[PDB]
């Protein structure tokens, strides 16, 4: 079960800037001392 809330004064959402964030492993392989480029969904920098 759930209940409803009441109207109140809230704050508008703000916008911030990312700084070298949103990088993960695009695969499950081991790569040492190489520069490998892949096409995959990531987070833009300075967005």
């Amino acid at each position: 079960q759930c209940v409803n809330l009441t109207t109140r004064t809230q704050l508008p959402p703000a916008y911030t800037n990312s700084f070298t964030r949103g990088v993960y492993y695009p695969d499950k392989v081991f790569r040492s001392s190489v520069l490998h480029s892949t096409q995959d969904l990531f987070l833009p920098f300075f967005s």
């Binding site: 492993y25 499950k28 392989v29 081991f30 001392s33």
Partner: protein
């Protein structure tokens, strides 16, 4: 399948090299890192007097 000296991060099963060739695969049941090398090949050269 030789015995390697390089450790793998505990989420990887494969492994490649600079030339993009699968030459290092982790054995799944005891977690050893083993390298892959082609057996041998070459040519039969002969010297004639």
């Amino acid at each position: 399948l030789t015995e390697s000296n390089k450790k793998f991060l505990p989420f990887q099963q494969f492994g490649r090299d600079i030339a993009d060739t699968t030459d290092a695969v982790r054995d799944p049941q005891t977690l050893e890192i083993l390298d892959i090398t082609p057996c041998s090949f070459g040519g039969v050269s002969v010297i004639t007097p």
